[PDB]
Design a protein around this ligand. Structure first.
Ligand code: ADP
Lengths: 191, 214, 111, 188
């Protein structure tokens, strides 16, 4: 009753899943049930400061939801039926959950991910998903593409270790260099 | 580890029906997997037997072809390739329904439109050429039978893998998830009954106190 | 399927001649394609044999049963393994002077 | 609790089928849970007026129950393999649930189906099921038989569309001719 009344009155639901609380996946925010009704009013701030924030966030939500559906499908009837793009969706969403969403609040690097670092990380992960999708649609086999771009995937997953103390200018340059090298690596793998 | 079901008596009955249906389906599918696996063991034994038969038949067909070529004094392969306008042998798929599956089995056929062989213009050894053609036709019939058996084997193995996967999925996900949902719904119904009991006890206490006052 | 009514032969020269004498393979005049194509180890190459086998399996929809020489299948072992689809069927018939190898059979490998 | 008490103290109970209502199949009366304890006492009136009514309704109940069990097995195991008799059972049950059981209350023809019309329709449907079963037992292929007898199936479906205002004398004559040609159409 207390939770139901609180949800009736409040506007933001940061629901926590205990299956994610275990296995040390903090924050354990259950991305499915969780919601926030302040996105519409924050669209103005996003347009003012980080214009691509809402579209990147919506893309991330779509990826997570699609991969949740595909995870139900794979848990039911295995991974043989899934298409290539399904494999990329699942892999990128697992990457997002393992690196982006999972934020250790007691490590030096991820104790406080500022707004600009979070925006850069969404840009990196969404760009990785888009590049993999484009490369596979070009005809490259996903297994070989993953074998060739494991370095790019590890660079993307390791972007959470970038120190926010280095300043917005220095880290954003590092993220731009990461994106450029990622694009070059994906182009080389596709070629 | 459960289903997001609203605790209600109707929902409890629906989940009990789901559990009963899942148990019945699990038993049925396990028995179907056992029957299909027996059929699969028979199929693979016939595959081994047909492989041995294929070996001996191809050996004798190669011997007959070599004898025919020696009798003719030249390789008839070029003439056969030249006279390849149409094929006198064809295979028609038949949907044989073994057990519950509908595995396709090839059925050989002979087309008399181009049934004429390359015996004419071979120079010599017409009888040897005809005997080699008959041996090769028997080998082709054996090949059609073996191909039908192998296609049935592949389809049956795929269907058995799917059925065993679904049996395991039921027994390890659907039955435990439904059982957990049943347990949670029963617990929540007991909780609602206990809350109603306490509220009625409070009402009874108030009525008794009023009676004592009056 | 009912459309697939043919017996593809990609075996050695002697086996191809035997299949042609049986009448399983033929060359379609209108389509300018041969159901039974004679190919040996020396003739063409391993890549050409693999391409022909792939065309027979996929491009040649009329092909129902594929007869490939064991010696030819040895160089096309990767293609045989990749051809996991039941239709068209693949038979591991061996060529002349080469006994059939049960281990080299792709279908028997699944056992 | 009100439903429990009413069922305990009632003689007839026409139960709601949520599945049939969600399909917009009307009237949405659940065959399995519904009942009527007046069948035995009404057997006298049925023997007096329409002698074959009780056996016909029992046959339709048996068909519906058998096909409900078979449809559970179908939803479980994909229905890849089914006997000819079982296929006829499911087809006949679907035909019944679409033409006999389902009726449009606001439609002119099916606003009020009389008792004689209902008896004639049960005659048609049960005779169709029995003749199909007999043909399948003879050895005919069900798919080819259905392809040949689609016209007869459409006729027994339009038996619902038969107007009731034409009178009992004329309509029964039409149903007499309906199953007269239905018997001959199964000879082929
Ligand atoms: N963002 C985070 N980073 C690292 N550890 C966390 C984080 N959030 C929670 N934890 C871990 O979860 C454990 C439980 O604390 P918490 O769950 O916050 O208390 P409560 O049970 O009141 O929610 C803590 O020991 C902490 O180490």
């Amino acid at each position: 009753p207390v939770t139901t009344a609180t949800l009736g009155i409040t506007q933001v639901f940061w629901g926590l899943d205990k299956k994610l609380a275990q296995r040390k996946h903090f924050p354990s925010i259950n991305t499915s049930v969780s919601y926030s009704k302040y996105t519409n009013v924050l669209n103005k701030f996003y347009d003012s400061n980080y214009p691509e924030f809402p579209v990147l966030r919506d893309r991330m939500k779509e990826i997570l939801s699609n991969a949740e559906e595909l995870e139900q499908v794979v848990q039911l009837v295995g991974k043989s039926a899934l298409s290539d793009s399904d494999k990329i969706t699942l892999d990128v969403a697992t990457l997002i959950k393992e690196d982006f969403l999972q934020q250790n609040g007691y490590s030096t690097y991820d104790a406080f991910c500022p707004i600009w670092k979070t925006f850069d990380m969404m840009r990196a992960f969404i760009s990785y998903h888009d590049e993999a999708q484009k490369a596979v649609a070009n005809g490259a086999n996903w297994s070989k593409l993953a074998d060739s771009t494991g370095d790019v995937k590890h660079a993307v997953s390791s972007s959470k270790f970038f120190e926010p103390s280095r300043g917005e200018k220095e880290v954003h340059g590092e993220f731009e260099k990461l994106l450029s090298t990622m694009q070059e690596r994906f182009a080389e793998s596709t070629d | 580890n459960r289903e997001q079901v609203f605790p209600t008596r109707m929902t409890l009955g629906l989940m009990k029906t789901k559990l009963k249906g899942a148990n019945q389906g699990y038993s049925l599918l396990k028995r179907k997997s056992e029957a299909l696996t027996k059929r699969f063991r028979d199929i693979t034994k016939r595959i081994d037997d047909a492989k041995q038969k294929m070996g001996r038949v191809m050996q004798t067909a190669a011997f007959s072809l070599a004898e025919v070529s020696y009798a003719t004094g030249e390789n008839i392969g070029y003439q056969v390739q030249e006279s390849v306008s149409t094929a006198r042998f064809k295979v028609r798929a038949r949907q044989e329904n073994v057990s519950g599956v509908y595995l396709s089995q090839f059925e050989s056929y002979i087309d008399p439109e181009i049934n004429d062989f390359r015996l004419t213009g071979l120079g010599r050894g017409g009888q040897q050429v005809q005997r080699a053609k008959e041996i090769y036709s028997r080998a082709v019939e054996t090949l059609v039978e073996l191909a039908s058996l192998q296609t049935a084997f592949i389809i049956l193995d795929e269907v058995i893998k799917v059925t065993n996967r679904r049996v395991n999925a039921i027994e390890h996900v659907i039955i435990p998830r439904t059982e957990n949902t049943i347990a949670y719904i029963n617990s929540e119904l007991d909780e609602l009954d206990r809350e109603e009991f306490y509220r009625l006890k409070k009402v009874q206490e108030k009525k008794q106190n009023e009676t004592a006052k009056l | 399927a009912e459309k697939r009514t043919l017996i593809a032969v990609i075996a050695d020269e002697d086996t191809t001649t035997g299949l042609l004498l049986a009448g399983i393979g033929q060359i379609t005049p209108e389509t300018q394609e041969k159901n039974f194509f004679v190919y040996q180890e020396g003739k063409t190459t391993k890549e050409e044999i693999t391409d022909k086998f792939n065309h027979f399996t996929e491009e040649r929809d009329d092909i129902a049963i594929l007869l490939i020489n064991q010696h030819i299948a040895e160089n096309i072992r990767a293609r045989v393994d990749s051809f996991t689809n039941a239709f068209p069927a693949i038979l591991e018939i061996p060529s002349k002077d080469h006994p059939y190898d049960p281990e080299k059979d792709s279908v028997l490998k699944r056992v």
